[PDB]
Design a protein around this ligand. Structure first.
Ligand SMILES: Cc1cc2c(C(C)C)c(O)c(O)c(C=O)c2c(O)c1-c1c(C)cc2c(C(C)C)c(O)c(O)c(C=O)c2c1O
Lengths: 498, 498, 498, 498
């Protein structure tokens, strides 16, 4: 009998769950504590959400150890687990207008992608990663056949324990499923520390599993403070695995728990500085458009998006002045409004956090080729900014903006390794990109970039079986791929003899 | 023109290298600093060995970045790399009397295994792991074939960088090669922080590569202090990977560098508490002998050896009183002496470090069924001790002895899960064992033990293609196997389109 | 608008397809030719089925070359192919009472397995082998990196062409899916030459794909004469691959087309002489029961079933006299009748074909310990026969019975290699078996048997990811496993350079 | 005490073995039968070689079943087998002047490649394929873990039996080793039916194994008649495997034994019609030279060499008239003579067999742009011929020449699929080629060619780890690669339970 302040918004009764779903039920935090959520389109508040404490971390990793151990999920055969996980996708996509508008409402994400991605892109990873439940294998090798005896082996892939779930702030709901598939499938159960700014898409998901009847205590979400609930899950002895994506900061401090508390594996992701090295030889009509889609996607709140958009001289002002036109083409409106092409940032201070970045570089001597300050309306709409020719020593060409701020640079006509060593030199080593058509110019674009997905001639390809991770300065541990069930599952050995 | 105080010992001119082989040559430490080595058979000293400083860690990870980058090893085709690594095995096994007697002399290891293991067991892993040089593969998947375009992919396996080499103290030379194969092969070069108590087997190896002409700066060894040279390699920015085996201690403090300095992967191993659950149903003649070989091997200095030798009641005193006879059968003598069946421990205080362990349990109420104190001769020979019936709460049945101290326990006749939950409860989760013949009693021995190599009906199988690692409380990262070239090699992605 | 003589039988409207589904539709043979089907429970006929000609083999391998080339299946991306193949499993298992009762009706298979296997066992291999559609890989090696140039490679796995489908007679429907998964998945399309005695389970499957909307001309089934339709598919130039299981005869004559017509690969399976070497040490209660289930399964029409049931002396009459009781325990009734434990053979003359086998050995001097002749009822029920002690030179201990005729032999108490060389000497080298508990007696049971699945302590394990084939005298080419997509997919090479 | 008519030729005592090395010794054929060898440089004879009978095929496959079964090779551990096979490479390359000049003398091969390839290229495949002796693996999967029991598996890779060795006529010695590595390594032994025209390089190899002391009866070579010794090995029951490369003819008649005699696997290769589709965009200086090296290599006796050298219009006469100059540049001389760039064909009538091919096309209307008839000197030197513009219907543009007869065609400037469908239409589907630099023109060159090694921008790369085979009309079964030990080794299954 969970309570909801029923929100008949966007032609649908939005019920975004408030409680802390634990032990089979949604419940409040310590003493009926709470934590609100913000309407980023206006700065408004939406509703009340309980915010757990260190009172709860004693409860989640002990109550979600029920599903792991005793009930249905702990032991049911390989089929119905996926077959139950698969039925989730049956209910969920039916209610995309729930997860579309909600994530259109929670994190202000535009409705146009709120339908395609914010439910659709989740519908895929439910069914692609619900695959390997009854399909995962041993691989068991030729042990020493010890004469005069006869030997054997069979290693295997086994679940680990209980896991940590730190969804980032930017992509709240869809990046729940991207970490609700590779975690549950490996045999274990989950306990989620969502983003509390937009936790209402996250908490909305588990209610469907309620009807969907997954074994009790298999999935439990947990809003909370920044580094208490995270740390309290970051140090508990019971927890076995840990999922997070966010700043570069939290890890080097959170990764000191893992040197101490319980040596359990770690899974952290950091934002990046993808250099999108556009030559001019590619089709200039698409060198700008998908180039313009390369950065300004989903109002700039893109995880890997390339904020250093190199261009050859021959098309720069061309690419600029055309893109300069394209910077004007966008729509700023209600994300649930179909025509909306640009919405507000996630949060209030962050629009500040982006603007000074603009202000930083502009003071350096940066060609503020448009905007750079807040769109003059409630919420935190920001003017899509376009710098120019900013070299590396400046502060804008090193910091992660976290905004739709196209921050160009430039090089010599046809350069391969030098300026791309201005694409190679950034320590944020997540993504990359390139455009080209003569691929005697894509033979040296993708070999040498020490990046984690060394694209060529495209970008923006959020698709389920693209196995993904990051290199040095944005984490380790791969998501959205087969290795996702490479670490999540523990390797046993055996060694018989007769 | 390296200098050696030529040691014509054991019918052979022992030249154990003293210097710090860097930049292509063996050289001394800071200001001609040194660090001695101990003769564990007598407590004597052998010779002088320079001990590097933080002056050197600026030199190794910058000079061994030469082989990686510019010379032969950085770029030569896949064949001659193994073909050069393979020629190493041509020279080395010819001089087993070098690495046999030396390791018979350095770490006091008996000659009987000094020939079979301390060179022979190294001769294997040179040639089994010199295999995959020109044999390692991509595995490149079906990317979204994006209509109306046509797509592709090809991931790959790439070297990482420069690595850290902390050979443990116990198995000095052979465990060099076990980490001189999986490291060099992946494309990178190596820099070795050996055990300085017995660094003279370690430093002896690289001289053969000198004749063997491996590319310069590919292999460089480095004696040094405990946690300076280790830490100074534990924090440098240049270093990319790190190899160590030793105490459980150093990691939880060393693993705080990896949360900070440069996030590079880690590879650490800790000693263990393998419960060797001998039923009586196995052949009692071999239930004792290989059981007796299960612990007392190479004078107790065994990395995974089972120091909790469970036995059913029916054979306990039988297994005891027979093994009690077998505890007497052993030889204590010069390890290079063929008849020697038991030598001294590694080091002086450690024989203390083992004896109080004996003294600890005996004060608890432990049946000191023999010995327990130092063999009355120079060096640090120790009397093979046999306790009995020691339950878990005591200090001996929880601590790692690090000695040939057979520390029994006991259970009910035919028990499967309970007493093996006294085999399951220890957090040192490296090895295991079991004996049995009716393998309706090996169906529940090996499934449930949360250990890393869940043996059945044998033990002691140091062989090259037995892929090995540890579980929770002794590290993470697998050695001596195919996954050894699973982490050492970085995964790239590509994504074309036409 | 396919026609069906609607059969409201077994509480369900059996529509078993009659036509020759080609070019997208079910259609009749040459000139409206036909070929009937037999009710094996009674000798009755069920309905009319067109029987194609050499008029059709010009049509199938030219019309099913449509799906391969132009329509949806030829080019759709990796996902929906499985996603369309997966939706097949959505419809099909819903109508198990169709494929259960039909195969309960077509081939007289008992309903008890008609539900579990004759639809259930097909439901698995739809979903396990619908896996590898979007999951199959290249594996692309280190080509000579030719200095002063720079090289590469990427091999791949590609579909072959059009294939040949000869389902055997015994397991009509379920062995359709076992060859409807590994064939379709590799990129190609299929054309089926089913068993015309029981083609009504086979032809029933493709109607569901009609609703299931697989690309046109991807699947086409074809009843026909014995060695015309088979030969006419055995010699056509267009056909690229060929699937068949049946007698040892047809191949050595059919394999002369492959030396001539078009050199395309071949896939043939032959029945076998699995020696099921039961020691007595195994649990005698299960040494008989699963031993009795080892032969008499699905009324003896078992593909690999062990018809030489060795036993130690100590239990022979015991195992006999108990099994002698068990030979009486069985039910002979309507296969769709739940209590039915034994049904008729497939066909009329075959019950003859089995009885003389009985008659053969009995004339030799065989202890006809029960029955041996026809059950006195319509259809062709046969009395479960049990011989004894028949040695090898006789005709029964060499011929394939193709019946539930438990044909024992015997040996010395505890013999390992000699009598098992009466298990080793038979050239039918498909299966094997053994029972044992002390597995110092399963150390020499399974090493030396030159068989294709060298079982120990079980049998009867028809499961999807058990990769299966045969050795010398029963074919070559493996089914029900990963190598199934090892041959079906052609290996390309490439070799770049820059 | 083998006899040799000692030939102190080429500054070295050529001992080419005459006998039939069987049962450990070299011996003569039936009744001291013989079979000569021809000096192709002059038509001269070299010496006497016994030619076995069907008297011998009773001896080889029974005497070489000794090594397989009883002696050293049957059972010695994995190391020394390669270690003995590896020592072969120690002796053999030392005597390259033996195998260089001999093959310079036997098959008239030029000394320039007689050193690099005819011993050097053999020295590689001895050591690359002597690798996998002690390195080959199981791969043993997750069998149904059948609750309430606990299951396992371990498949493996096992030797097959005795094999058939039909070295072709063209590349006599080096193609011995290419089939002396993948055969011996898999556990079995070998019996060689070499080319009797040039059997003196072949028979020369096994003498070194005599000193090299491989286990007796592991290797036995056998000169003989065309289709008796081949057929007599083609039908024997004992033989298990079969190796041959030669005409397209012998197989479709020899492959009728395999449908009958003993169903054992088959390995046959046929010559090809590689279309070497040179665009003009590639460097025209190398478009001719390596193009000219693409066909005229080792005096035209090239197994896969592209005898249909397409060219764009823009460079045709250019490529022609320059290559026309290059057709003149070559040297015709003694193959052991260093300056020799062109030698005679293998045999007397074959130079006829090539000339009428010239005569065939020239009568069709072919531009005989040079030569076309015999070089006017003893032996069978042939004038390097260059046709032009010959379209497909003619006889020269369909037949395999088997000569250095550059037989051009032509197309439209920049054509991709049409004229390459004159590269795609030939049913000889072994090799291919292409030149290009803008690899928007190598994106459609290599995808669609139904060939077995779909080259781009190079050719002529005989290297050991290039896994090789053929497509439809030149055989099946891959050589010089990892799959070479994919078929040669039989797959076992096991299936335990507890
Ligand atoms: C991967 C693939 C899947 C296809 C499928 C799926 C959905 C089953 C079809 O259904 C289908 O109809 C296809 C036919 O078009 C088809 C197809 O062509 C390819 C393909 C492609 C796109 C490019 C290749 C290249 C490029 C660099 C040009 C190679 O270099 C190369 O070597 C290849 C070979 O491996 C190679 C190749 O196989």
């Amino acid at each position: 009998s969970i309570d909801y302040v029923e929100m008949a918004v966007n032609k649908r009764t939005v019920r975004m769950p408030h409680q802390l779903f634990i032990g089979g039920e949604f419940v409040d935090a310590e003493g009926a504590k709470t934590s609100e959520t913000i309407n980023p389109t206006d700065g408004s508040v939406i509703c009340q959400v309980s915010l757990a404490q260190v009172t709860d971390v004693d409860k989640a990793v002990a109550a979600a150890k029920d599903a792991f151990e005793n009930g249905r999920w702990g032991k049911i055969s390989a089929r119905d687990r996926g077959r139950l996980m698969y039925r989730l996708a049956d209910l969920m996509e039916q209610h995309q207008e729930e997860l579309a508008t909600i994530e259109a409402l929670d994190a202000g994400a535009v409705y146009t992608l709120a339908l395609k991605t914010h439910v659709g892109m989740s519908i895929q990873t439910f069914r692609y990663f619900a695959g390997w439940c009854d399909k995962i294998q041993g691989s068991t090798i030729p042990i020493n056949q010890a004469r005069p005896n006869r030997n054997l082996t069979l290693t295997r892939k086994e679940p680990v324990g209980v896991c940590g779930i730190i969804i980032p702030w930017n992509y709240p709901l869809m990046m729940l499923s991207w970490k609700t598939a590779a975690c549950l499938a490996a045999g274990n159960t989950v306990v989620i520390k969502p983003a509390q700014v937009t936790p209402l898409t996250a908490l909305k998901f588990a209610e469907l599993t309620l009807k969907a009847g997954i074994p009790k205590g298999v999935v439990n979400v947990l809003p909370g403070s920044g580094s208490l609930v995270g740390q309290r899950l970051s140090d508990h002895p019971d927890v076995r695995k840990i999922g997070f994506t966010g700043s570069t900061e939290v890890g080097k401090h959170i990764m000191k728990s893992c040197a101490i508390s319980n040596v359990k594996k770690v899974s952290l992701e950091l934002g990046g500085k993808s250099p999108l090295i556009i030559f001019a030889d590619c089709d200039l009509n698409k060198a700008v458009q998908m180039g313009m889609s390369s950065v300004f996607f989903n109002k700039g709140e893109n995880c890997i998006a390339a904020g250093r958009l190199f261009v050859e001289d021959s098309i720069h002002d061309e690419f600029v002045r055309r893109v300069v036109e394209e910077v004007r083409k966008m729509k700023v409106g209600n994300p649930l409004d179909r025509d909306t092409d640009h919405g507000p940032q996630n949060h209030h201070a962050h629009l500040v956090k982006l603007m000074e970045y603009c202000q930083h570089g502009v003071k350096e001597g940066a060609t503020l080729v448009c905007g750079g300050n807040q769109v003059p309306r409630p919420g935190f709409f920001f003017e899509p900014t376009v710098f120019t020719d900013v070299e590396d020593h400046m502060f804008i060409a090193k910091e992660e903006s976290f905004g739709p701020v196209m921050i160009i640079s430039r090089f010599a006509d046809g350069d391969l390794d030098a300026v791309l060593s201005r694409a190679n030199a950034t320590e944020f080593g997540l993504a990359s990109g390139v455009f080209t058509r003569d691929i005697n110019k894509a033979l040296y674009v993708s070999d040498k970039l020490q990046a984690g997905t060394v694209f060529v001639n495209t970008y923006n390809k959020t698709d389920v079986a693209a196995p993904f991770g990051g290199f040095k300065q944005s984490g380790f541990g791969k998501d959205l791929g087969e290795a996702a069930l490479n670490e999540y599952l523990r390797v046993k050995t055996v060694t018989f003899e007769y």
